[PDB]
Design an enzyme around this catalytic site. Sequence first.
Site, PDB file in Angstrom:
ATOM      1  N   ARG A 119       0.858  -1.164  -0.105  1.00  0.00           N
ATOM      2  CA  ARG A 119      -0.082   0.047   0.087  1.00  0.00           C
ATOM      3  C   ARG A 119       0.811   1.367   0.028  1.00  0.00           C
ATOM      4  O   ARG A 119       1.932   1.203   0.422  1.00  0.00           O
ATOM      5  CB  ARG A 119      -1.098  -0.064   1.153  1.00  0.00           C
ATOM      6  N   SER A 145      -8.525  -0.023  -0.114  1.00  0.00           N
ATOM      7  CA  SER A 145      -9.399  -0.351   0.999  1.00  0.00           C
ATOM      8  C   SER A 145     -10.119   0.818   1.368  1.00  0.00           C
ATOM      9  O   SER A 145     -10.883   1.167   0.506  1.00  0.00           O
ATOM     10  CB  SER A 145      -8.610  -1.306   2.331  1.00  0.00           C
ATOM     11  OG  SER A 145      -9.505  -1.636   3.182  1.00  0.00           O
ATOM     12  N   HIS A 146      -9.814   1.143   2.473  1.00  0.00           N
ATOM     13  CA  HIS A 146     -10.649   2.367   3.005  1.00  0.00           C
ATOM     14  C   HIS A 146     -10.033   3.277   3.265  1.00  0.00           C
ATOM     15  O   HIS A 146     -10.437   4.384   3.621  1.00  0.00           O
ATOM     16  CB  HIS A 146     -11.119   1.924   4.366  1.00  0.00           C
ATOM     17  CG  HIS A 146     -10.093   1.870   5.554  1.00  0.00           C
ATOM     18  ND1 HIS A 146      -9.298   0.872   5.414  1.00  0.00           N
ATOM     19  CD2 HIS A 146      -9.868   2.777   6.516  1.00  0.00           C
ATOM     20  CE1 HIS A 146      -8.551   1.175   6.409  1.00  0.00           C
ATOM     21  NE2 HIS A 146      -8.708   2.391   7.236  1.00  0.00           N
ATOM     22  N   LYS A 183      -3.533  -6.676  -3.117  1.00  0.00           N
ATOM     23  CA  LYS A 183      -3.614  -7.661  -2.030  1.00  0.00           C
ATOM     24  C   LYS A 183      -3.695  -8.996  -3.196  1.00  0.00           C
ATOM     25  O   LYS A 183      -4.342  -8.847  -4.202  1.00  0.00           O
ATOM     26  CB  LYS A 183      -5.255  -7.805  -1.652  1.00  0.00           C
ATOM     27  CG  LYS A 183      -5.589  -6.654  -0.794  1.00  0.00           C
ATOM     28  CD  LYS A 183      -6.967  -6.534   0.025  1.00  0.00           C
ATOM     29  CE  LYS A 183      -6.887  -5.285   1.023  1.00  0.00           C
ATOM     30  NZ  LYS A 183      -8.225  -5.496   1.745  1.00  0.00           N
ATOM     31  N   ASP A 240     -16.959  -1.286   3.583  1.00  0.00           N
ATOM     32  CA  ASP A 240     -15.784  -0.604   3.465  1.00  0.00           C
ATOM     33  C   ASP A 240     -15.597  -0.464   1.864  1.00  0.00           C
ATOM     34  O   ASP A 240     -16.075  -1.017   1.198  1.00  0.00           O
ATOM     35  CB  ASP A 240     -14.448  -1.261   3.968  1.00  0.00           C
ATOM     36  CG  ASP A 240     -13.937  -2.387   3.275  1.00  0.00           C
ATOM     37  OD1 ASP A 240     -14.661  -3.201   2.838  1.00  0.00           O
ATOM     38  OD2 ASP A 240     -12.516  -2.811   3.545  1.00  0.00           O
ATOM     39  N   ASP A 266     -13.745  -1.552  -0.615  1.00  0.00           N
ATOM     40  CA  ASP A 266     -13.328  -2.617  -1.618  1.00  0.00           C
ATOM     41  C   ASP A 266     -14.165  -3.935  -1.211  1.00  0.00           C
ATOM     42  O   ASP A 266     -14.137  -4.694  -1.736  1.00  0.00           O
ATOM     43  CB  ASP A 266     -11.891  -3.013  -1.341  1.00  0.00           C
ATOM     44  CG  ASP A 266     -11.618  -3.426  -0.067  1.00  0.00           C
ATOM     45  OD1 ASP A 266     -10.886  -4.612   0.094  1.00  0.00           O
ATOM     46  OD2 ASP A 266     -11.917  -2.992   0.989  1.00  0.00           O
ATOM     47  N   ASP A 318     -14.661  -6.380   1.342  1.00  0.00           N
ATOM     48  CA  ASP A 318     -14.372  -7.276   2.312  1.00  0.00           C
ATOM     49  C   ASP A 318     -14.700  -7.233   3.850  1.00  0.00           C
ATOM     50  O   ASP A 318     -14.356  -8.102   4.431  1.00  0.00           O
ATOM     51  CB  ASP A 318     -12.906  -7.876   2.105  1.00  0.00           C
ATOM     52  CG  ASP A 318     -11.851  -6.744   2.255  1.00  0.00           C
ATOM     53  OD1 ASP A 318     -12.188  -5.568   2.713  1.00  0.00           O
ATOM     54  OD2 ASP A 318     -10.778  -6.830   2.275  1.00  0.00           O
ATOM     55  N   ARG A 319     -15.269  -6.273   3.986  1.00  0.00           N
ATOM     56  CA  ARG A 319     -15.574  -5.857   5.467  1.00  0.00           C
ATOM     57  C   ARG A 319     -17.155  -5.256   5.167  1.00  0.00           C
ATOM     58  O   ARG A 319     -17.447  -4.436   4.518  1.00  0.00           O
ATOM     59  CB  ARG A 319     -14.590  -4.600   5.805  1.00  0.00           C
ATOM     60  CG  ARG A 319     -14.169  -4.554   7.150  1.00  0.00           C
ATOM     61  CD  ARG A 319     -12.774  -4.186   7.738  1.00  0.00           C
ATOM     62  NE  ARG A 319     -12.498  -3.043   7.157  1.00  0.00           N
ATOM     63  CZ  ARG A 319     -12.569  -1.824   7.424  1.00  0.00           C
ATOM     64  NH1 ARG A 319     -13.395  -1.843   8.807  1.00  0.00           N
ATOM     65  NH2 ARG A 319     -12.309  -0.611   7.150  1.00  0.00           N
ATOM     66  N   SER A 364     -12.009  -6.299  13.288  1.00  0.00           N
ATOM     67  CA  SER A 364     -11.910  -5.121  12.162  1.00  0.00           C
ATOM     68  C   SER A 364     -12.884  -5.662  11.315  1.00  0.00           C
ATOM     69  O   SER A 364     -13.378  -4.804  10.040  1.00  0.00           O
ATOM     70  CB  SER A 364     -10.578  -5.114  11.546  1.00  0.00           C
ATOM     71  OG  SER A 364     -10.469  -6.279  10.518  1.00  0.00           O
ATOM     72  N   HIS A 383     -13.944  -8.391   8.968  1.00  0.00           N
ATOM     73  CA  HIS A 383     -13.802  -9.359   8.107  1.00  0.00           C
ATOM     74  C   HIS A 383     -14.484 -10.525   8.782  1.00  0.00           C
ATOM     75  O   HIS A 383     -14.077 -11.071   9.626  1.00  0.00           O
ATOM     76  CB  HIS A 383     -12.331  -9.589   7.945  1.00  0.00           C
ATOM     77  CG  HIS A 383     -11.781  -8.573   7.081  1.00  0.00           C
ATOM     78  ND1 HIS A 383     -10.853  -7.466   7.898  1.00  0.00           N
ATOM     79  CD2 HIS A 383     -11.545  -8.419   5.832  1.00  0.00           C
ATOM     80  CE1 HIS A 383     -10.454  -6.540   7.092  1.00  0.00           C
ATOM     81  NE2 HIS A 383     -10.722  -7.195   5.709  1.00  0.00           N
ATOM     82  N   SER A 413       0.393  -1.724  17.917  1.00  0.00           N
ATOM     83  CA  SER A 413      -0.219  -1.417  16.489  1.00  0.00           C
ATOM     84  C   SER A 413       0.986  -1.750  15.504  1.00  0.00           C
ATOM     85  O   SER A 413       1.961  -1.239  15.803  1.00  0.00           O
ATOM     86  CB  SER A 413      -0.711   0.075  16.514  1.00  0.00           C
ATOM     87  OG  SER A 413      -0.872   0.436  14.884  1.00  0.00           O
ATOM     88  N   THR A 433       1.141  -0.111  12.546  1.00  0.00           N
ATOM     89  CA  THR A 433       1.125   1.221  11.706  1.00  0.00           C
ATOM     90  C   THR A 433       1.104   2.193  12.352  1.00  0.00           C
ATOM     91  O   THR A 433       0.743   3.399  11.773  1.00  0.00           O
ATOM     92  CB  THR A 433       0.056   0.870  10.699  1.00  0.00           C
ATOM     93  OG1 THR A 433      -1.496   0.910  11.354  1.00  0.00           O
ATOM     94  CG2 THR A 433      -0.168  -0.387   9.942  1.00  0.00           C
TER      95      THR A 433
HETATM   96 ZN   LIG Z   1     -11.261  -3.932   2.802  1.00  0.00          ZN
END
Ligand SMILES: [Zn+2]
Length: 455
Positions: free
Chosen positions: A12, A100-101, A110, A234, A236, A238-239, A319, A321, A415, A417
């Site tokens: 990313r 993603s978001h 991915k 979200d 893309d 997947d959430r 999160s 998923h 965390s 990130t």
């Molecule tokens: Zn996502």
Amino acid sequence: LPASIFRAYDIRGVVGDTLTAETAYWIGRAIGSESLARGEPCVAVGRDGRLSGPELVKQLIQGLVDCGCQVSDVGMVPTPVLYYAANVLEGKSGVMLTGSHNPPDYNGFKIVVAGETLANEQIQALRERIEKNDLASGVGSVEQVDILPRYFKQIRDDIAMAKPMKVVVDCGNGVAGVIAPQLIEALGCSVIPLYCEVDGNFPNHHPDPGKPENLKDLIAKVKAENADLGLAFDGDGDRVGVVTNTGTIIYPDRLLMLFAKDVVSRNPGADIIFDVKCTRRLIALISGYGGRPVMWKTGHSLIKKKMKETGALLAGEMSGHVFFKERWFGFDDGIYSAARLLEILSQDQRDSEHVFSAFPSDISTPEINITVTEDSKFAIIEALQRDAQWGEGNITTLDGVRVDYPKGWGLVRASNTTPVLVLRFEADTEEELERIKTVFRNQLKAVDSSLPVPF
Ligand SMILES: [Zn+2]
């Protein structure tokens, strides 16, 4: 060149900065090489509705073809739809170009190779193929594929809504709007669309149902229209986020409770996976219904590996998923999970609020963040793991330090990130809560008396 874009579960960065077409090209090259190395020439490619994408795919695909791979391009689609292609097409490889978001100028990759979702050293492997120009070369191929209709059809054939429901669907101007309102409509519902126009500008809230602020318009529309449920995807897809007919936000751990009860009724002894941030209630509930509870690490990609490793029929993480293997393919997908959720609720005469309200609730704190420093982040968890004393607590150090007591628990981890320590606590009575927030406070101070502990 470079690197901070080769993260643990993906790649990313900023589309016109750390990540430029050029960078995308030498990544498609890496991916194509590895897939070939695993004996897989056929790779799929799908993208989200970002502004930076329309082109990118290009540098990515050029990278695959200049390896000799047979690229099956599926155009703009949801992430799980790309994962779906890599499961049903001929090739078991797939690449989804997505951010993603994250904000509009972020984008990324991915990667699925020969069935496996690359992570950690598998991603670095890719980079380190560029740092030495150890990629392959060949006369690739590019074919256009249209999978959405077959994806659309697969779920519709699988789901059985009993009663009708009115649902508010918020896409966040991300790529879910290409099939989510539609399929849910097709599923047997009436859909109030909220921001279901693909627009990489994100004129409204960003597509991150993980932050409550981004469910405010959703929560109001449900109430205003007297809808039975509210859903939020979200960027893309997947959430998925969920709110009841009265506007209560259902967290994924609680969502999994409903899903585990369902999956386990048809599959005695089924393994069910959740992460170290999910309520312990999940453990007892799964066990009670006859299943095998499996606490694992946080990280969509890690959850996914664990699933294939244990044969688990269902997984989820805090999160959002949700991973279904029963009746499905075992990857995360907010769209299918929505479907599955509508399926269950449609068969209960109670409203969504009561269905979820009926489950046991303990006293929980919200997620707590402690800004420390990049240098100290991991070392603080290590010092705890080495020297903290927790009584007769059961210590899980799979992902930071989680300690389970009979009447409550707490978690502290770093965390990956941000230079931040993330904590959570839960217990039945408030007297046990504070006694747990106290054992953690003390162990933290024992590491460093000057650490700021807000609890
Ligand atoms: Zn996502």
